[PDB]
Amino acid sequence: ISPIFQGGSYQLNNKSIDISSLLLDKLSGESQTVVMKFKADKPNSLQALFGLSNSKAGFKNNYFSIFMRDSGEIGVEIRDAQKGINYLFSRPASLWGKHKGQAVENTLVFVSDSKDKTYTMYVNGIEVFSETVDTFLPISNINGIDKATLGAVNREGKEHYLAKGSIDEISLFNKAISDQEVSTIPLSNPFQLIFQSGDSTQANYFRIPTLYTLSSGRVLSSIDARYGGTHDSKSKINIATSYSDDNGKTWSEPIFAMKFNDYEEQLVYWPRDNKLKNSQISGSASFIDSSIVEDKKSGKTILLADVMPAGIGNNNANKADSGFKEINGHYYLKLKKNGDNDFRYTVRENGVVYNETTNKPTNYTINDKYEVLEGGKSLTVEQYSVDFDSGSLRERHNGKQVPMNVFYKDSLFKVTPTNYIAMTTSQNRGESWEQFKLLPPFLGEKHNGTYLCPGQGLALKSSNRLIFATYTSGELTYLISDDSGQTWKKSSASIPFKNATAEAQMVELRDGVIRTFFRTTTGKIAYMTSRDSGETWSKVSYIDGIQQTSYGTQVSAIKYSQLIDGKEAVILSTPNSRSGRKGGQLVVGLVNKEDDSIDWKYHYGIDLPSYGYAYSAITELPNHHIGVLFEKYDSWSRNELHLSNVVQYIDLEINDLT
Ligand SMILES: O=S(=O)(O)[C@]1(CNC2CCCCC2)C[C@@H](O)[C@@H](O)C1
Numbered sequence: 274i275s276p277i278f279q280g281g282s283y284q285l286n287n288k289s290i291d292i293s294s295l296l297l298d299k300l301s302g303e304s305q306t307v308v309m310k311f312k313a314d315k316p317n318s319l320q321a322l323f324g325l326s327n328s329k330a331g332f333k334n335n336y337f338s339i340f341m342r343d344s345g346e347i348g349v350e351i352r353d354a355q356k357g358i359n360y361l362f363s364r365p366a367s368l369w370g371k372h373k374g375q376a377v378e379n380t381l382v383f384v385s386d387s388k389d390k391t392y393t394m395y396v397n398g399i400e401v402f403s404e405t406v407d408t409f410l411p412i413s414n415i416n417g418i419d420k421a422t423l424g425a426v427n428r429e430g431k432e433h434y435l436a437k438g439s440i441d442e443i444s445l446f447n448k449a450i451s452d453q454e455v456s457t458i459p460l461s462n463p464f465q466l467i468f469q470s471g472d473s474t475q476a477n478y479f480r481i482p483t484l485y486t487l488s489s490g491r492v493l494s495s496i497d498a499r500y501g502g503t504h505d506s507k508s509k510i511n512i513a514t515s516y517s518d519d520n521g522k523t524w525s526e527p528i529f530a531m532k533f534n535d536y537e538e539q540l541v542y543w544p545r546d547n548k549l550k551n552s553q554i555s556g557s558a559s560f561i562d563s564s565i566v567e568d569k570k571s572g573k574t575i576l577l578a579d580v581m582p583a584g585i586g587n588n589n590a591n592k593a594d595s596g597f598k599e600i601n602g603h604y605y606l607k608l609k610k611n612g613d614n615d616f617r618y619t620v621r622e623n624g625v626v627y628n629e630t631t632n633k634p635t636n637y638t639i640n641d642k643y644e645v646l647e648g649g650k651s652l653t654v655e656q657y658s659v660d661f662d663s664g665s666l667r668e669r670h671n672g673k674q675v676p677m678n679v680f681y682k683d684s685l686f687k688v689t690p691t692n693y694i695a696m697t698t699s700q701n702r703g704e705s706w707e708q709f710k711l712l713p714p715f716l717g718e719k720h721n722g723t724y725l726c727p728g729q730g731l732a733l734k735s736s737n738r739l740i741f742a743t744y745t746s747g748e749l750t751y752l753i754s755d756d757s758g759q760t761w762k763k764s765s766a767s768i769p770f771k772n773a774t775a776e777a778q779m780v781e782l783r784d785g786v787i788r789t790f791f792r793t794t795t796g797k798i799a800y801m802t803s804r805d806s807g808e809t810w811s812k813v814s815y816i817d818g819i820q821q822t823s824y825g826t827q828v829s830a831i832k833y834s835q836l837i838d839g840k841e842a843v844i845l846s847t848p849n850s851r852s853g854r855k856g857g858q859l860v861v862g863l864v865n866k867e868d869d870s871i872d873w874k875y876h877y878g879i880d881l882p883s884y885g886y887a888y889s890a891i892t893e894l895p896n897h898h899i900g901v902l903f904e905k906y907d908s909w910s911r912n913e914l915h916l917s918n919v920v921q922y923i924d925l926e927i928n929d930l931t
Pocket residue numbers: 484485486487729731732831832834891892893894895896897
């Protein structure tokens with residue numbers, strides 16, 4: 274249909290604009306759609322963009338509003354005191370503010386659907402909420418509506434929720450337009466989506482992005498596909514990947530690099546209310562925190578991730594057990610058989626399950642998928658599914674059988690309930706991935722796995738050496754391979770920290786010289802340097818000039834291939850805030866060749882200081898642009914759990930940054 278009203282170029286300068294005469298007589302029927310293209314790069318803390326109200330004395334709670342907050346939250350109110358209805362629907366981190374020095378034109382579509390009794394909000398082509406109610410309130414049927422307003426709500430003849438911004442276009446339709454119709458509305462987005470709700474992963478949530486530029490020019494990304502809301506392990510989480518062959522313009526349909534099948538891949542709306550939001554899938558195995566590198570020797574792409582057994586995460590992993598028995602310099606995975614209270618078995622050569630107490634082999638073997646075989650034949654378990662149909666999270670068997678895996682809750686043989694690191698490889702630059710293999714333990718029989726630093730591993734320029742950063746209590750633990758990941762050794766570097774989440778990323782400043790930037794508990798990003806290709810490490814220093822919170826956030830880091838201001842350059846990506854995970858920046862530093870020190874010369878704001886920015890991935894695209902894939906929300910805040918389509922990709926040029 275055609276809009277019953279359409280106007281534009283409205284400047285909202287803390288002063289309401291009345292559009293009553295142009296709109297109120299046209300409002301008809303119980304279903305409406307509002308389409309609004311608007312900018313707000315200096316919003317007030319809470320402001321209404323559009324209001325429909327009964328403006329009379331005594332009726333201050335009779336109105337409809339579309340509002341936003343300076344946090345980037347968008348919402349609506351739908352209120353009628355005589356009907357006893359007071360609806361408030363919203364979602365944090367729904368908006369953009371600025372991009373490349375210009376206010377972003379956000380495209381908002383709000384559908385009020387009387388037949389399905391549903392209110393649905395889209396911003397920038399993303400469905401941010403969809404709420405069905407028992408008693409529907411048509412926005413046109415609020416008792417005594419007599420005012421239509423831009424940039425405020427008129428209550429008792431006075432302006433509430435005054436807005437600063439502009440509405441470039443606004444249209445109203447007397448119909449609830451379909452999802453299909455919504456998708457045809459042209460957007461002006463500064464970002465794109467690589468992974469998204471409803472894609473091939475069937476995860477509704479994503480966290481922990483990575484990017485890496487391959488020698489062929491293909492750009493590869495990995496991610497946590499998180500099924501049970503945004504929670505870290507314990508949960509159901511898989512590692513997914515996608516690549517671009519056109520410098521980030523388009524991306525492949527995602528595939529899995531590491532996955533478990535003990536729980537179904539379900540697209541679930543995870544509850545955001547204060548009773549249920551901490552609901553957590555508690556019987557599933559998971560992978561978490563991935564990292565990518567390309568190997569020059571084999572040409573293979575190598576991906577590492579943490580592996581969590583069923584119901585295990587950082588908080589409950591056995592810190593004093595590696596999960597392996599060392600026997601004469603060989604490490605064997607320990608197993609516990611159902612019924613036993615101890616681990617009386619090991620996985621030996623050729624996958625033979627060996628009884629340690631009788632020193633004889635059993636009739637059981639483990640294949641390369643870590644699946645259990647008895648007399649060469651595959652054992653199975655029954656898969657689980659999750660639901661909230663009873664009002665709380667329930668995890669239950671679903672009638673489907675899958676191969677029995679030693680990482681599963683239902684397995685006859687189970688691994689130690691602790692965290693591990695696994696690796697997979699791809700021989701076709703991310704078009705498929707091999708079955709994962711566990712890395713050996715690096716800190717002895719009585720220490721859990723170190724924790725992989727998400728992002729990039731480091732391939733050295735003048736050798737075939739690969740390095741992956743990991744952390745544990747009291748140190749960074751660099752994992753080094755000189756043979757395409759076939760064998761590994763550790764290089765430990767002490768850090769002035771107990772129990773820190775010391776997520777670290779590396780850049781090669783010049784041949785054999787590596788600088789590692791890492792998260793701390795001090796509110797400052799730290800660094801150390803190696804001058805022997807990772808064998809040994811310097812004391813720790815700190816960057817003055819970038820702020821983090823007390824708990825910190827992952828920092829991603831690259832060495833740019835081109836000179837900037839005639840100097841070699843490093844680029845960091847991080848929130849720059851003492852307060853929260855917000856105020857995302859790229860920080861460009863120039864290297865002083867005298868002493869390898871870095872002058873942090875340029876700061877580019879990704880978006881408003883108050884808008885969310887958490888974990889991030891950066892890479893130089895083959896065309897010398899910079900690609901950034903990042904969590905556009907505050908991933909620490911307990912108010913911003915379980916948001917869909919907040920991991921977003923942008924393309925920047927060096928001139929944008931300087
Ligand atoms: O120098 S590499 O370590 O091989 C790497 C790629 N360099 C190309 C150089 C040519 C321009 C594009 C980026 C940098 C890391 O951030 C990864 O993306 C891999």
